[model samples]
Target: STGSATTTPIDSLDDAYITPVQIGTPAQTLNLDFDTGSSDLWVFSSETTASEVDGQTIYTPSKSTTAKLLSGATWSISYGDGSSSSGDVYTDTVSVGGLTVTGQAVESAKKVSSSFTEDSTIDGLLGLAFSTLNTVSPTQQKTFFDNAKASLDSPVFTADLGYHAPGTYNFGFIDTTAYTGSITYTAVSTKQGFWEWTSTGYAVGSGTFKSTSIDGIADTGTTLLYLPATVVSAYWAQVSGAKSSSSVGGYVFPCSATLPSFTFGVGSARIVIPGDYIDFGPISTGSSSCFGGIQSSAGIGINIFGDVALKAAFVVFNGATTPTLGFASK
Candidate 1:
């Protein structure tokens, strides 16, 4: 069966998009971040100690008659940003939009990192990545999308993310009206459980477009664009007063600087990101220093086309025989 969901901005930060999901027999609804970077459906649950949880709502399995504990099963996950969570497992009926997957694996968090505990708005994470990235031990678990794919009209999903505006995540069917211009298709390599691909280099401002191929992943969970240190440095070199700062972290520049637009090549298509979008909010309120949305991924191994880049295009996660990605302008 086909399904669709509305994605709302978590807050002014535009860090992650949140969607409503239901779990259990009677259905315990919660707002979850649809993360394409990882595959593990986890939530803050009653298993978490009261002191460990802040203002976030907890998913109490005891209240669901259909909840079944998975003996000796556990899951743990850590992100590039250093946030992490771990917990026990349970089998329950999980539903998203009109899509329902029975006997779905649900990780109930008993421990969470300081970064997660502080963000009290998001109740859980709904992983949309491949099941190979699942964190369950002994026996790996299938993701909600993996289980629901069998019933979907088509094994595809589209992400239409906006800048500080409501967006949408559609499954099974692609909405032609959600985007404009032709969709440029590119082959995706998911050996690492990510929607990874290579781009034909990029250009800063109105400069000549480079043709070097740069491999990267399209991660919806990450908030900023992360490129190789050299590539990041090249872009910042064009922005006067931009420098690597220890206190501000990453690359920082004056808020008043006139930045340049960035463009990345995908196959024959070149997607352009406006200059203003690269100016991640000010270092702090009332501060003239602003963090650059594009930073170095020196140690992360792979570059990340995070929200900073993804927000500039409409994306399609094509799950055909050979996985591919389709990008278009909104």
Candidate 2:
């Protein structure tokens, strides 16, 4: 069978996208952040600390008759940004779009950091990365996509993240109408437990496309695009008054600066991100200086094709024995 879900931007700058998912027998609905960067389906729950529960919708397993505790199961995970969460485990009926899983492992958070609590838009996150990265202790648990792949019409899922509009996350089948031309497929190396792949080259605006290989992960969870310093510096050079500011913690430019589009290659196909998208809101609310959507991945080591880049194309996560990724202009 096939499943499809609508994607809604959490904030005006497209900080993240959320999709409504139904959980439990009585069908409690919650909006979750769908992240291909991490493999942990953790959520704020009734078990969370009272003071920490901002305005997020919490999952109450006790109300669901079908909810069963996974004995001795526990999970703890932290993101590179320093936000962390740890929780107990439960198996319950979970539904995404039209697809339903009978016994999906749901990580119920007993603890969460301030960052998660402050974001009232997302109740939790749905991990679409490889199950090999699951954080569950005692025994690793399968991710929602991992558990549903066998039953899906095809062992593939696609992400269509929008700039400032709604998008779609479809499973089992890729909607042909959603994209133009044809999709370009590339090898995916999941040995590192991510949708890791390499891009051929990049071009600044209408400049020459320099052929340079960049290894990066297709991370839907991340907010911006992170590339090597060489690529980042070249792109920023095209914009006047662009500076690497310490106070801003990244590259920032005058809000009035006219930006240039960035184009990256998927094999021979070029994926271009609109110049307007590069201005990631402002450094501060109502500030005249704006932070960059594309930054240097110097310290992080691995280049990240986060939401900024993902917003430019439709991505397919093919979970075959030899997993591959497909990208199409949309």
Candidate 3:
């Protein structure tokens, strides 16, 4: 059960942001990154003084009323970018939105090399997507969803991706204000911790990408949609200012004007991505341009449907019932 497996949760998590349930008192806030590509909530830490943790929020257990570090446990993760970091473990009280869960064990790396520290805002990442592709699983890891299932409000979590800043990240008590009005639900095949999506169709630029079925895991940690090379090229051909470049990677194109609007569907929600969010950036040399949020990671093997596409609509992962994902109102 790898790229494909059916899974329902003991409880589900949404693609939204739930105020973090902190381990220490005065419970700090944490941002949840819905990563189907990986599992584990990795936050920056005061101990990471030697690394590149510039923009991220670092949790200083010493400042908290109830923070405790794990003695010998250590964690380090590396990405395709070649940057890496290492740190120790700690325990604290964690909260999301408003719900508080006590005694939740989490990770805080002392060192980080990815631009995640240099490029993005906020402090740390909360991984709610799932574990099939998680890098931390090798060391034996579990998510807040795994630990807080029994106490959740609905045993479910959904994501509405059609607004600002790559879409709004909400959680727990659903914010109807963030939605279009009707939530579209997809039935998840209950099995293991794997994302399963059924695409209404596939498109390249304005033409259909020629795939009959578009199903895969949903991940929030990823910034773009990892489509295949042929599909990416064909789609780019339809956009006016779009020109694919190997240097820009598959999805990164070279365009002066905003790219085209793309529409894809799940359940009843037909998610739409405006060109601006297609490739969010400070586009420059070596930066991802032209290409919208969807890119070509053909060599990576699996077609990763990242945040770009999700931001087009509401997304929900029903870990509790049939292991399905739900969509917020359009």
Candidate 4:
């Protein structure tokens, strides 16, 4: 029963990396953002208020012969970005690339935040985080990967996220051809239901590497790299013409600046993010000012190693008894 799957990224976005997924018996396909920061496979559905849905595909469970209501079960979730979604549950077949899982819990959205409604590209979210993070009430549901892992040759998945280009999410097995050099492994502490781990140290550009332990989560759903306020300030201090702006909501810098690269340690491995990736994007519409991708996680509590950091390396999400993460160059 060994099987695997692959998901390709949609038109490039600094945001979520989405993939096509089929739900129900008749197979209603939806382009869902594969988020490692959260758990719960949810989609915009017929149950969603018609007026609330913008230009997105809606899944109709009633149309699928395999759909079965999870009687009285429901879920609601809100992200750090303030985006939210709420829905009921249905047990149905779900397929991703070449892999299929029968009776997977599918959360159908009845309501969604403006952030989700405004984004027409994504139909829903397919969470890759631990099952413990699932938001369903009464009975927490297992993710598609959690239910399908038993059938996989190896309890692993790999993410190859690219910058403004196509990336791949491979499940069950890792393609040796997709990466270069040896994969650096690090112990993961999944007590928080996140791909949480501590970096041995970090450095700004080619400067001295600080041996301070930095604990954070590998969150694919988040667009920026969030660290402690002191760490953010330290990095900004090295950059000329970089300043924090209340109006901009984060550190803004000259778009033309030759930004310095930043590096963080994973075990003995150092993951370096190119300077260009640190310059997230323009502060606002039609502006030359750019926001720094490395922001302070002051209010957010835990640090988030987002797309900016993840895209720099090929990541392995190994869900073994003591889940460990592996990193390698693309």
Q: Return the TM-score for each candidate structure.
A: 0.97, 0.99, 0.77, 0.96
Taking every candidate in turn, the Cα RMSD to the unseen true structure, in Å, is: 1.2, 0.7, 7.0, 1.6
For model 3, residues 1-330, the per-residue Cα lDDT tens digits are 001111111111212222233446776654444455455567777787745765555677788877776666666666444655557777677766445556565678777766666644535656675544334423555666655666666565655544343344344445566667677777654233557566665654455434355655576655577766766666677666566565655545555655766666664456566666565543464654534566776666566667667766666666664576766535
Q: Tell me the spans in candidate 2 whose CA falls farther than 4 Å from its real position.
A: none
Give lDDT: candidate 4, residue 12: 41
lDDT of 2 by residue, 10-127 (tens): 9899999999999998998989999999999888999998898999999999999889999999999999778999989999988999999878889999999999999999899999
Candidate 3 global CA lDDT score: 0.57
Candidate 4 residues lying further than 4 Å off, grouped into runs, are 1-13
- Candidate 4, residues 1-330: lDDT per residue as tens digits? 344344444544466677888888778989888889999899999999888899899899999999999999999999889999998999999988778999999999999999899989889999989999999999999998899898888999888888777678888888899878879999898899999989888999989999989999998888889999999999989888899999878899988787888898888888889898787667677888888989999999999999889998899999988898998877
Candidate with better TM-score, 3 vs 4:
4
lDDT of each: 0.89, 0.93, 0.57, 0.87
What TM-score quantifies how close candidate 3 is to the native fold? 0.77
Error in Å for residue 202 of model 2 = 0.4
Error of 2 at 317 (Å): 0.8
Task: List the candidates ranked by lDDT, beginning with the highest.
Answer: 2, 1, 4, 3
Task: Give the least accurate 10-residue stretch of model 4, judged by summed lDDT.
Answer: 1-10
